[PDB]
A paper describes a structure:
In Escherichia coli, isocitrate dehydrogenase kinase/phosphatase (AceK) is a unique bifunctional enzyme with both protein kinase and phosphatase activities. The reversible phosphorylation results in the inactivation or activation of IDH, which regulates the branch point between the Krebs cycle and the glyoxylate bypass.
Two Mn2+ ions were found in the active site of AceK, which is different from the previous structures. For the two metal ions (designated M1 and M2) found in the catalytic center of AceK-Mn2+ the catalytic core displays an identical position of M1 compared to AceK-Mg2+. Each ion is hexa-coordinated by oxygen atoms from protein residues, ADP, and water molecules. In the Mn2+-binding site of AceK, the two metal ions are both bridged by Asp475, whereas Asp477 is only coordinated to the M2 metal ion. In the structure of AceK-Mn2+, the M2 metal ion indirectly interacts with Glu478 through water-mediated hydrogen bonds.
Author numbering:
A (entry chain A): 1 to 494, 504 to 574
B (entry chain B): 4 to 69, 75 to 493, 505 to 574
Amino acid sequence: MPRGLELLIAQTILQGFDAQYGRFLEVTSGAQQRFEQADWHAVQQAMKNRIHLYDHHVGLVVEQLRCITNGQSTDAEFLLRVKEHYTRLLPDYPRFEIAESFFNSVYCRLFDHRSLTPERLFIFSSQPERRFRTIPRPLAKDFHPDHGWESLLMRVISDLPLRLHWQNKSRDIHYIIRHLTETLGPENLSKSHLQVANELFYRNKAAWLVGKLITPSGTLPFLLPIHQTDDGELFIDTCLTTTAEASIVFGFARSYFMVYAPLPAALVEWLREILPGKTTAELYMAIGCQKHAKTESYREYLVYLQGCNEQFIEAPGIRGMVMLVFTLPGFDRVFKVIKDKFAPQKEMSAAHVRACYQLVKEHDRVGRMADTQEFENFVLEKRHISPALMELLLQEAAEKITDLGEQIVIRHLYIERRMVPLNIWLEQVEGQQLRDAIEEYGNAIRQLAAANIFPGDMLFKNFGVTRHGRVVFYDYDEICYMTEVNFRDIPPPRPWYSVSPGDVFPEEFRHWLCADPRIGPLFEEMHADLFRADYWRALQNRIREGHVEDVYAYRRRQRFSVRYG
Amino acid sequence: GLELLIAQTILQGFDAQYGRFLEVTSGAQQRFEQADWHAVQQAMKNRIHLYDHHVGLVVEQLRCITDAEFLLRVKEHYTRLLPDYPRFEIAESFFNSVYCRLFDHRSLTPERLFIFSSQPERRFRTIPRPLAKDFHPDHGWESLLMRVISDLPLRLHWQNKSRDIHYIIRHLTETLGPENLSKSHLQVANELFYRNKAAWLVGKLITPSGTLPFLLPIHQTDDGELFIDTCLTTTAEASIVFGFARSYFMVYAPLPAALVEWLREILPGKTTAELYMAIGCQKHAKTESYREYLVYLQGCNEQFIEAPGIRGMVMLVFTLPGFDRVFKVIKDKFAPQKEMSAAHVRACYQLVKEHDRVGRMADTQEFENFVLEKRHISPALMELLLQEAAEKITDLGEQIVIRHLYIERRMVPLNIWLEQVEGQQLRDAIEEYGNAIRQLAAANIFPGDMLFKNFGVTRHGRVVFYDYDEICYMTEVNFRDIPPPWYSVSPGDVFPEEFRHWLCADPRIGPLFEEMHADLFRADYWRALQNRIREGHVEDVYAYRRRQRFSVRYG
Ligand SMILES: Nc1ncnc2c1ncn2[C@@H]1O[C@H](COP(=O)(O)OP(=O)(O)O)[C@@H](O)[C@H]1O
Ligand SMILES: Nc1ncnc2c1ncn2[C@@H]1O[C@H](COP(=O)(O)OP(=O)(O)O)[C@@H](O)[C@H]1O
Ligand SMILES: Nc1ncnc2c1ncn2[C@@H]1O[C@H](COP(=O)(O)O)[C@@H](O)[C@H]1O
Ligand SMILES: Nc1ncnc2c1ncn2[C@@H]1O[C@H](COP(=O)(O)O)[C@@H](O)[C@H]1O
Ligand SMILES: [Mn+2]
Ligand SMILES: [Mn+2]
Ligand SMILES: [Mn+2]
Ligand SMILES: [Mn+2]
């Protein structure tokens, strides 16, 4: 059959996705054991492995199509008929939204991400928003405080599958009660109850219980991060009940969660209540469905673009000397394209830059580096581009632009969450907002360093400030691993004094970072360590000794050991 | 008064320089014992840079101390400091380097600096401290080798001393026959030669018929026990271990010239410069190599010519017909295809110079203002020089000056070799070509433009990469599968399937490649290598045929 081939391909693609998501779940399933045996280097390798799964299976499916069709995998009318058959397979399939993403990826491979039209692939979903039926398996369990909250929480902690001893179980329970009472007041507390997700959300050294705390006045997040003693005993480090704290825990600058989710769209829907600020793409990316989040983000971009009456402009701030960065005035994302030629001092390849972006992508981002989404042959309407930006694009990125009459195609760019560059933020805020910004800036350095990321060019212009006031690094092309750096004490005179590649003089940092009397004093007060090579070496040594530094996705004040010790 | 102060400042600088050279070298044992392989790598980078640092310091000292006859008197005072001085040959090199910095490598004459040595050669004298120890088999060879192995200073336990000893006995017996073995002994150098993950015992195997190399490479278990991976007793094998395409050895040598002399008996093919460069005296090797060049030039009766093979589109390459080196100068303008800087090219040569060359990349010696006699230059080459390298040439009447060039050991370009060699020799060449790729890939070097014309074949048949300006790190590359039936490219993209067009177009060669190196056309193979690199693993590299490993030829 000519029609058999069309169906064989459609079933091949869908089979690939069946397997891909099955392997995604199998890797994720192993998060508990990795946590239980504190194999923190297995945890990090698992995040890289799971990140690579989708592209692998897309690749396999494409080579299968290549060998099966013997040429027609490039025929477009053929693959438009495959798409019709594939579309008709989706109404019964549970993960249909991601099945469309997987087909999209296969299509884009076949045609080098060219010729993307709404008829040839699922730029938009082919299925209605008719998915709110009662979930085949409950994804959460209700817990009411019929016998009070002490032995409510003592069942919840009891039902956890974790196979380790608790350091002091009821101590932690009382901590949680203190927080809940101080927050709701005893009367309302006894009226409210929990609905907690049945799967734990794992990240690095933490196992997060994620619930909804439903109260008279409304429903709130309920997050308990579970950590491990150096010995191997479990404790709950805190309790977060604000949407703001939850937004940060599920933040774009953190590694994705490892959470066993056979129906991700259902888990995504359930999370909306406690994450009302997140787009659908952001929620999918928070539970690890990164590639589907890409699909959803291009849709979010299209929605915004068509309803905005603004043009693309260069992003405000200090112009990059390797990246060209533009945005839409009201849009929450930036577009970053690598320049054709970098400043004449700078001897590095565009490929190095791309490699640094991939390094960040599969690293523990530790709440301090933004997630990026790489796009190839991104298409823009000429009419949507500021004349200022269009002139810039053709000066600096000409080799990456091709004309298509009323449109252009950018060969390669990254999409990143938009922030306020810190060099602008520090000119905008005073007193306490300014203190908190410098605290966060220095903490950004420290946490990246302890995670074996040396930021390289640490100037304020290379950090961004989020909606919740957090400082996040985004200039990735001078990153190196901490272990690759040679920290030295005496700064060179500023010829005959020997300095070799990889030499860093933290004492030199104070010249840039304390030049402004509004800022220096504050940096000195809180981050003087950052000017001592011995401090950096200490972090370097702990890293070489295999140690992995704890990271708290919330203020240190909120730790039970702190606010109640 | 200054003239003597200057001579003493320079000589003092060298005293410190070589002292710091030994101290970096001193730490090779501990680095090996604790398998700190990235410490090994950085110590090689550090030690390579030591000399230029100390020259820089001395030059800044001389500058702050603020004629032509003047510096002939500085040189005369310096010369008078040398007759007792033990490492005088390198002291002369160090003076030469200080002079060249002060004078931007201009006006180099035999009177103004030590183009040739000021002292009579001293290989006559008895070494003040023995550098090697004799070992006779009075109680047989089983407990001879257990004496040397026990006497080693290495502080680790052995996987199986007695096995490794038996292994070595098999080799010696199979090589000499039980009779010649009995009237034979070892003279083994007292310092181990450290390189990457190996500690080499280096000896002389003295037989009735003559003297032979005796090399035992000492390796480490993944857990940390010592074993001897083999025993090499041919000069050819020794020449390869000390080859121009391998990293220098780290070997404690208080009298480097004495060690060079001792090394001559084994390794009889190497120039003096090559022996100095094999034990890490890279800058002094440059001095000795310009002397070797001058010697050859005066006795040759031929002119400089463009080097045989495919003309380079970024480098211009010439040589002397009977000479063992090529000169490579960066072109003024590159072919319109290649979008790159002279600075990129210089950077890639610098990458290779301080990289573990892993036996697959040639060492280069950079020269500034290299002076040639016009009468020595072929009219063909002279036209090429002025067409392609005009900005780098200045006229000085009867001579020209090349601003910048690299000198490299000369080989037969592989595209020529493959037209010369057949059957088994041809199989061996393609085996080596693919292994050069593989070994470079595992060392995080992506060769870039891997066509045969960019590799050379050595005197001993080994394939060595020499086109450095398209090198990049494996970790910087994005290996991709080709979309079916053109398609274009994002930064770093490489399509290993495309290799087949170029590398298998010839029916004499392609088939042999598929047989032995089909992996190299599969994106999965390269991606696998990429990951092993990122997951921190460092690939073993054996400076000898895999067959010769004891675990293989005896297990
Ligand atoms: N996530 C972001 N949000 C807002 N602005 C950004 C973001 N990333 C980059 N920019 C802006 O683009 C510029 C260049 O970004 P950067 O990644 O630092 O490129 P380069 O390496 O060329 O300096 C910055 O100075 C800043 O103005
Ligand atoms: N070590 C060498 N031995 C012999 N010939 C060489 C050597 N290095 C370069 N060549 C010759 O010079 C040419 C250009 O060398 P290469 O380094 O590849 O320059 P390019 O980068 O311009 O290709 C080669 O095609 C070959 O003929
Ligand atoms: N240039 C592009 N324009 C719009 N969508 C794209 C583009 N490239 C990839 N995508 C979408 O991103 C998702 C993942 O693609 P890929 O990264 O190719 O696996 C799919 O939904 C694709 O259709
Ligand atoms: N252009 C040159 N011609 C001849 N010899 C040189 C040249 N440049 C450097 N040398 C020699 O190379 C050795 C090291 O020099 P340098 O690279 O300047 O440290 C010294 O013996 C120098 O005399
Ligand atoms: Mn920047
Ligand atoms: Mn940058
Ligand atoms: Mn070449
Ligand atoms: Mn080249």
